[PDB]
Amino acid sequence: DILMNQTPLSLPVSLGDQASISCRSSQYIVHRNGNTYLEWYLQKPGQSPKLLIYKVSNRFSGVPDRFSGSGSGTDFTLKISRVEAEDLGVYYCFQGSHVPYTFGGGTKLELKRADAAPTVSIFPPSSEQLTSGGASVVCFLNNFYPKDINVKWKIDGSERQNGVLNSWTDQDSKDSTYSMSSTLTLTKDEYERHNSYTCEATHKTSTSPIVKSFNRNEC
């Protein structure tokens, strides 16, 4: 199959900025019946993908002229001359030259804002949950920017990976931040074999991780 490599993976922009998205195919996109089928789609949250550009450079009806497509062969580009709010979403290239037809991995056009540290909060298991013989430790990491973040769990000083489940929020429409939950699920019996529970967030806003923890024996 023809691999379509889209770059960048995410593109932070301020409103008014120009934006440039690249798409590279693993082989020459040849014509069929004189048409070179290279298309760009924009998907917005909860909606279907909508066509912006067909046949490399052709602007689909209703698409404004700040969008333009260009390129040939193995190298294609989508440009937005001056980004507006409604342009945010995930852009995909698509080739209809070689069966099976294929999409790029997506470029997420996002809003730029001042960096912000996550607000971290840790929560021991509730007593209701403990009664049922389960033990979930929950960590919230809220309102951070940029979106790249790493969470690490430690139990009495040892890193712990199995039983961890994360969930990330979309960019907030108002403050443009991201948020995440991390949840470490254990049996009651295992939860009680250990005292110290730590949630470590690594984020660019610091070279030191943000640490939040509690000792089971002081709760």
């Binding site: 689909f60 698509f94 069966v99 099976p100 909060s121 929560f123 979930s136």
Partner: protein, 218 residues
């Protein structure tokens, strides 16, 4: 206008088949081909097949053994049908006009979210998340609600009914074994909890469940 209405199951048993009907309007199936595409968080967009206007088909090589697309020109119907679905066939499925030539006659179906699972309808357990006994008090306080082990999606979470809108984050569900889990956080002024009540309201329409859980200090 061009429209592509899809109809089909939201849920399929493991190893059973998926049937979606795409009903087309605004253009003729004798003139234009219709593609099928699916989308998952892991795989991005994935082209599955096409039925051309002359009625021949082409299929993604990885699906040829279990995928057939067909149609009824006069009723403007395209039929997508895939056998032997498994967990990793969970995706949003679209019929669509692609490889386009014209300004105009090009749309996509709304999209059919298909989950492949044998889980039974199951209400959520709801647990309050209050800060630990030895937590520091800081000027804002964050509370939460853990909604665990339910099926199918969705649940809705509100706080103090509609009263608490600001400072809320409800995170997307994730599967844990055969069941879903999510949590919701809310951040209020420290002065106002626990003195003023904070209660998460959880609804799971599928099981006809409504639970309120008051967040009380440990």
């Amino acid at each position: 206008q061009v429209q592509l209405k899809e109809s089909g199951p939201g849920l399929v048993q493991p190893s059973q088949s998926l049937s979606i009907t795409c009903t087309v309007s605004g253009f003729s199936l004798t003139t234009y081909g219709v593609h099928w595409v699916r989308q998952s968080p892991g795989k991005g967009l994935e082209w599955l097949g096409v039925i051309w206007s002359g009625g021949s088909t082409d299929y993604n090589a990885a699906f040829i053994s279990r995928l057939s697309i067909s149609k009824d020109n006069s009723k403007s119907h395209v039929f997508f049908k895939m056998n032997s679905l498994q967990a990793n066939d969970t995706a949003i499925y679209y019929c669509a006009r692609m490889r386009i030539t014209t300004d105009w006659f090009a749309y996509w179906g709304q999209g059919t979210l298909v989950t492949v699972s044998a889980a039974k309808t199951t209400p959520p357990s709801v647990y309050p998340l209050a800060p630990g006994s030895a937590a520091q008090t800081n000027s804002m306080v964050t509370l939460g609600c853990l909604v665990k082990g339910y099926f199918p999606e969705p649940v809705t979470v509100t706080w103090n009914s509609g009263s608490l809108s600001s400072g809320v984050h409800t995170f997307p569900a994730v599967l844990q074994s055969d069941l879903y889990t999510l949590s919701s956080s809310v951040t209020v002024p420290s002065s106002t909890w626990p003195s003023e009540t904070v209660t998460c309201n959880v609804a799971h329409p599928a099981s006809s469940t409504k639970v309120d859980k008051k967040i009380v200090p440990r």
